[PDB]
């Protein structure tokens, strides 16, 4: 239920030839819930612990999505961090998995970023009125969201009629539990330059290049 007790769980699992948690560290989407758990100070604390997980050899240095997914779906790691979309691939594997609340840190819970999957039309396109018909009458319908969700789940769909089937899902509860603990991303144009700054800051700290105090300094400017 807390991040501070994962290193202990890794010692217990490494004795039996298994990992504790493998997740895509390369993308800052996945390291953010821990980094922004307490909050600056909160980020220093949040990131310093993540560095210690790799420093103690509990997590691998170049942990990407492919090996993190495969490891949990094979049964080599007892945990992994991913969104609704990844469940369909676990269902393919013979794994009795559960989706739960992210681990807390320094008391306050992990605040992940809440993506709102969206669909927009391009400006330089002659098929503007043809794509509109598709998004409304064919895709964002009872039937259209089923065909996509059954392939690879979306999460809590925006459609009001799907509230019944969403509530019935125990995984949507764990996802929505983490969303109310977290916050939605601001759409602003500076997210690209921000996310790039966080992506580099985590990679420099994970590989062993820049210090945690020097990461926030460079990432603020």
């Amino acid at each position: 239920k807390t991040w501070e007790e994962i290193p202990a769980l890794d010692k217990e699992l490494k004795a039996k030839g298994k990992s504790a948690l493998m997740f895509n560290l390369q993308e800052p989407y996945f390291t953010w819930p821990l980094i922004a758990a307490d909050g600056n100070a909160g980020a220093k604390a949040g990131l310093t612990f993540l560095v210690d997980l790799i420093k103690n050899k509990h997590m691998n240095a170049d942990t990407d999505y492919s090996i993190a997914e495969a490891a949990f779906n094979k049964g080599e790691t007892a945990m992994t961090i991913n969104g609704p979309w990844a469940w369909s691939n676990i269902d393919t594997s013979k794994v009795n998995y559960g989706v739960t609340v992210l681990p807390t840190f320094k008391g306050q819970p992990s605040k992940p970023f809440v993506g709102v999957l969206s669909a927009g039309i391009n400006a330089a396109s002659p098929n503007k009125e043809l794509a509109k018909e598709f998004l409304e009458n064919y895709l964002l319908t009872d039937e259209g969201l089923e065909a996509v969700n059954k392939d690879k789940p979306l999460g809590a769909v925006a459609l009001k009629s799907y509230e019944e089937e969403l509530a019935k899902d125990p995984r949507i509860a764990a996802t929505m539990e983490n969303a109310q603990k977290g916050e939605i991303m601001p759409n602003i144009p500076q997210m690209s330059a921000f996310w790039y700054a966080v992506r580099t800051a985590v990679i420099n700290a994970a590989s062993g290049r820049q210090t945690v105090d020097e990461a926030l300094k460079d990432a603020q400017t």
């Binding site: 559960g98 739960t100 609340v101 509530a167 019935k168 899902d169 125990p170 949507i172 509860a173 764990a174």
Partner: protein
């Protein structure tokens, strides 16, 4: 059959802790009644029929402990050291208050027997009804009641603590979450009477009256406690 259609009852199969508990419950309502002495003569036969009401009263109580338990085990169907540990305690308490209730319901049935004007039998059988004994009564029974509800609150908390492992859907959470609050609102009145008595403000029967008056005002005081949490 079911309270909630949106809840998936996991303990539909009868387990050892359900089967065990049942036995320990049966013996409460059975031995409360049959702990009595065998009517040997008509005189004793009509005496033992005065006791039907005390047990009617008590057994009604004991089936409600069983029914709030039946539902919890039906719901989550837990069978771990913590559920076991709590269950043990829930029953331990029922059992230690089995005959004490028999006495209270005998004592209250003689008090009420005189008010309606059915009987006028003496209460010197029950002993000296002093302030301290009447205060101990409120603190004694109030504790057992706080305790039984507190355990249900804790057993439903065990379910919420293992919500992800049991696979509790959005609808199943709100039931667990509410069933904690429901058992805690229920364990707040017996805690309040117990607290009021223990502090003893008036230093006389005015203390025992108030404490007894909170069990009549169970539903209205349940709404007062509930409205303060919704108003904020």
């Amino acid at each position: 059959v079911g309270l909630n259609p949106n809840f998936s009852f996991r303990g539909k199969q009868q387990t050892r802790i359900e089967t065990f508990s049942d036995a320990v419950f049966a013996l409460a309502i059975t031995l409360l009644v049959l702990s009595s002495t065998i009517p040997e003569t008509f005189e004793d036969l009509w005496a033992s029929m005065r006791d039907v009401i005390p047990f009617a009263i008590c057994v009604a109580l004991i089936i409600v402990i069983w029914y709030q338990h039946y539902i919890f085990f039906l719901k989550y169907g837990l069978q771990d050291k913590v559920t076991i540990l709590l269950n043990t305690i829930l029953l331990f308490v029922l059992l230690v208050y089995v005959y004490p209730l028999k006495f209270l319901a005998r004592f209250l049935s003689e008090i009420y027997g005189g008010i309606f004007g059915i009987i006028e039998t003496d209460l010197s059988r029950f002993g000296e009804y002093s302030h301290q004994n009447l205060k101990l009564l409120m603190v004694n029974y109030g504790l057992g009641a706080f305790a039984i509800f507190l355990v249900f609150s804790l057993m439903y908390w065990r379910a919420y603590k293992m919500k992800s492992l049991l696979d509790l859907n959005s609808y199943e959470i709100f039931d667990t979450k509410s069933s904690i609050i429901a058992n805690l609102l229920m364990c707040s009145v017996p805690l309040l009477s117990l607290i009021i008595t223990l502090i003893d403000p008036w230093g006389n029967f005015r203390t025992t009256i108030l404490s007894g008056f909170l069990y009549f005002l169970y539903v209205p005081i349940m709404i007062v406690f509930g409205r303060i949490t919704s108003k904020k």
